[PDB]
Amino acid sequence: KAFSKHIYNAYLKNFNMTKKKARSILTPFVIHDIETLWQAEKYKEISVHVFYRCQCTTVETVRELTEFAKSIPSFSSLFLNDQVTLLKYGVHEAIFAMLASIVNKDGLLVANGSGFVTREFLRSLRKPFSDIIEPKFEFAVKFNALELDDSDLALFIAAIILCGDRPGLMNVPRVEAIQDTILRALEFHLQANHPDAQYLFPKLLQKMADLRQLVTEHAQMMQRIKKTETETSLHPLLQEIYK
Amino acid sequence: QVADLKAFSKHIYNAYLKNFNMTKKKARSILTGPFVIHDIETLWQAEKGLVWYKEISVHVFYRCQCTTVETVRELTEFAKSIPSFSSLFLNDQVTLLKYGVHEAIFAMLASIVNKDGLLVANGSGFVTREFLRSLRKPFSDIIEPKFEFAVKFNALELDDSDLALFIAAIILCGDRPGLMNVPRVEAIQDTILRALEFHLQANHPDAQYLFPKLLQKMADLRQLVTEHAQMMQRIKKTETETSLHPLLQEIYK
Ligand SMILES: Cc1cnc(-c2ccc(-c3ccco3)cc2)n1Cc1ccccc1OCCCCCC(=O)O
Ligand SMILES: Cc1cnc(-c2ccc(-c3ccco3)cc2)n1Cc1ccccc1OCCCCCC(=O)O
């Protein structure tokens, strides 16, 4: 409860764009095509260009999630090396869980909420830049059906970072014990914050396995791009993660 | 990295302090200043007042067996708090323990040994090596090479904190037969061995060559245990009325 307050507080300190802020906008400049895209920017091609904007957004979200993890209690007392592994395998599951907050069925907020880019447009991109995008929308649309708010998400995101099964963890039991607290606070929080909704906690535990699968298939698609899109550059911060 | 290695060592040392009833520090204070057992008479006096059948050589062998079963139990609890030991496959745990306990047991046995004998029954007995030599073959023979190993090992003057990491390196051995995730085991061992190199510079700053010296003792320990296991084979073969504890049967199987 206090613990949940504190993670919420940390979430607010660290993420410029909260679901709260995002929902109030979604109910910005549309970008539904080439002309609109080009106007918004007022190079290789439109697709690789959109991909570079994805990369720019992911990079920044890694930075935020990195500062955020510093506030999850005991995270800072893990081996430095365990910290890095937790961040490495988890940031993308967190990044895709938080994507739901800025997405609706028709598209997503960009540039701090000033823009909206239609899901139509992103589908129009040539393969495989279309295929790496659309599966996130399918996930985000369902996730949003759970109607979580920011306070819930702050715990959700922390539970994802503190996952016991990452490859190469030295102290699994310690990481697991921190997560178990996070998961307990989260159950407690959902009872209190969503008391008439029913079965939310284990629906959320399932979403965590849905994301793990989503990031598997994303990593899968990224390495295909790493080869087949010979001329497409990848931010070095994103090279370590995919290494 | 440097700060993680320190903390990893400290974790291994705490696991050690919590799991072994007898540390070298305690053993050394007892040895330097128990009831001395040096003959049949003092032996029987001990089974009557140091409480903790067939013939003397076999009775001694049984007590050797009771103590090693107990140390195997402590080593299993110890390994449970070696960081990453408990999230290995359950079959890798059992395998690491089955092939490594004896190496760990004869490493640590140096802690409770001097050239004249060793502590028994948590430091309340001392059995002289002369008495153990006087036992009949093959029992006297399975004993004396551990003393020879222990005397030279003690000359390296390790302490508990060094030993905790040395023992962990013996348990987390990548080379044991029939492991499922060899690369994972090898990764933990390498981390243990880096932590060890670092801890020795810090704990033994004037000792030249101490780390490669310990890698060699690890080689010598493997040969000692091979030789030990051949002898246990010969005893199973030739001493038919002598029994072996079922925990030890599983290991030797
Ligand atoms: C998570 C996110 C947040 N914001 C954006 C975003 C930003 C600006 C644009 C835009 C389009 C036209 C101009 O700008 C599109 C998406 N994304 C990206 C994204 C949203 C939905 C589905 C999939 C996505 O990325 C998949 C590729 C990520 C590659 C790098 C990596 O693996 O790390
Ligand atoms: C490791 C240890 C620790 N303490 C003792 C100990 C205990 C009590 C007596 C005692 C003699 C009279 C009354 O009690 C002697 C030795 N040992 C045993 C031992 C110490 C030195 C050399 C060899 C040894 O074992 C040889 C047989 C091991 C068989 C079991 C197996 O393979 O697993």
Curated annotation (Swiss-Prot), chain A:
GO biological process: adipose tissue development; apoptotic process; apoptotic signaling pathway; axon ensheathment; cell differentiation; cell population proliferation; cell-substrate adhesion; cellular response to hypoxia
Ranges for domain NR LBD: 29-243
Keyword Mitochondrion: no
Residues represented out of the complete protein: 176 to 438 of 441
Organism lineage string: Eukaryota, Metazoa, Chordata, Craniata, Vertebrata
Subunit structure: Heterodimer with the retinoid X receptor. Interacts (via domain NR LBD) with CRY1 and CRY2 in a ligand-dependent manner.
Keywords: Activator, DNA-binding, Metal-binding, Nucleus, Receptor, Transcription, Transcription regulation, Ubl conjugation, Zinc, Zinc-finger
Localisation: Nucleus
Post-translational modification remark: 'Lys-48'-linked polyubiquitinated; leading to proteasomal degradation. Deubiquitinated and stabilized by OTUD3.
Expressing tissues: Ubiquitous with maximal levels in placenta and skeletal muscle.
Signal peptide: none
Protein name from the UniProt record: Peroxisome proliferator-activated receptor delta
Organism field: Homo sapiens
GO cellular component assignments: chromatin; nucleoplasm; nucleus
Function: Ligand-activated transcription factor key mediator of energy metabolism in adipose tissues. Receptor that binds peroxisome proliferators such as hypolipidemic drugs and fatty acids. Has a preference for poly-unsaturated fatty acids, such as gamma-linoleic acid and eicosapentanoic acid. Once activated by a ligand, the receptor binds to promoter elements of target genes. Regulates the peroxisomal beta-oxidation pathway of fatty acids. Functions as transcription activator for the acyl-CoA oxidase gene. Decreases expression of NPC1L1 once activated by a ligand.
Single GO molecular function: transcription coactivator binding
Similarity section: Belongs to the nuclear hormone receptor family. NR1 subfamily.
